[PDB]
Structure formats: structure tokens, C-alpha cells
Design a protein around this ligand. Structure first.
Ligand SMILES: Clc1ccccc1Cl
Length: 162
């Protein structure tokens, strides 16, 4: 297991434009296209991302190419964020993947509400952190995924993903 395999389980793989859990147009492995309700706007973002006229459909290779870029940018964003970097750097590699997972799903702005959880994580108060993490819109709206990510933070193992 690693961050790619982890997100591939949590995000799935779909080669046609679909709506994510929040109703936003998305493709591939959780590649958010736009928060606009316009499918035409989404199709434009897709074409822009792939570099060709896709007509709303992409290949597995293209999906994986976007996925690699998205993971890379998520991690790099963490390192560039003064509130996230110290916590991330304090973590072991397994819990780091859990951190990347969260940012991938909710973005840095979504993670901004988690200040108290991040402090507990930096403190390595794992059980307390896990309890705090579940007190969130995130957990309530995607409990099965949140439980997997939280278990990963709690234990520093890949138990929740087999
Ligand atoms: Cl970047 C991030 C997201 C969620 C928990 C910890 C960290 Cl460092």
C-alpha cells in the first residue's frame, strides 16, 4: 500500500464525466473538473487538462496521468502551506499519506477547519486526534472513507485498506 493505491481505492476510476459526492463534475481518479453546474464548462476544463477535444471521455492512461499530477500538486501544496508543513513533516510516511488523502478530497481550504486535529496529530496524541477528526462535516458526509483515513492516522498502519 501507498498514497496512489490508497487514493485509487477511495476515489475509484471512471472514464466518463461523473458527479462526485458533493455533486461536482469530476473524471478519472477523483479529478475535480469544476464546481460549476455547467457540463459544458466541465467539458472545457477536461479538454484543457488533457490537451485535446475529449468530448467528456478519457482513457485509463490519461486518467492516471491526471492522478499523478493531482497527487504531486497536493503534496507540494502541503509543503508550501505554513500551517500544514510542520505537522506533515512531523509525521511518519503512513500518516503522511493520510494527510495527502484529506487534502486531495477537501483541498487546503477544507483542511483549514482542522486546526485542532492537526495540533493533536503533531502532538502524536493519536486516539484523541482520531476522536477530534470525526467531529466534522467531512466524517458525517463521507463516513466510510473518513473512518479509513482516521484509522490510518490512529494506528500508522494500512489496516483499513488491507
Ligand atoms: Cl496536510 C494535513 C491534512 C490533514 C491532517 C494532517 C495534515 Cl499535515
Amino acid at each position: 500500500m501507498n498514497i496512489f493505491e490508497m487514493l485509487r481505492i477511495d476515489e475509484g476510476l471512471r472514464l466518463k464525466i461523473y458527479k462526485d459526492t458533493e455533486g461536482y463534475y469530476t473524471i478519472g481518479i477523483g479529478h475535480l473538473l469544476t464546481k460549476s453546474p455547467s457540463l459544458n464548462a466541465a467539458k472545457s476544463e477536461l479538454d484543457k487538462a488533457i490537451g485535446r477535444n475529449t468530448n467528456g471521455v478519457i482513457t485509463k492512461d490519461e486518467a492516471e496521468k491526471l492522478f499523478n499530477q493531482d497527487v504531486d500538486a497536493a503534496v507540494r501544496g502541503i509543503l508550501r502551506n505554513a500551517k500544514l508543513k510542520p505537522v506533515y513533516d512531523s509525521l511518519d510516511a503512513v500518516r503522511r499519506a493520510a494527510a495527502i488523502n484529506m487534502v486531495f478530497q477537501m483541498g487546503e481550504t477544507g483542511v483549514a477547519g482542522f486546526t485542532n486535529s492537526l495540533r493533536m496529530l503533531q502532538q502524536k496524541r493519536w486516539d484523541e486526534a482520531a476522536v477530534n477528526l470525526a467531529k466534522s462535516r467531512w466524517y458525517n458526509q463521507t463516513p466510510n472513507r473518513a473512518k479509513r483515513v482516521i484509522t490510518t492516522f490512529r494506528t500508522g498502519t494500512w489496516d483499513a485498506y488491507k
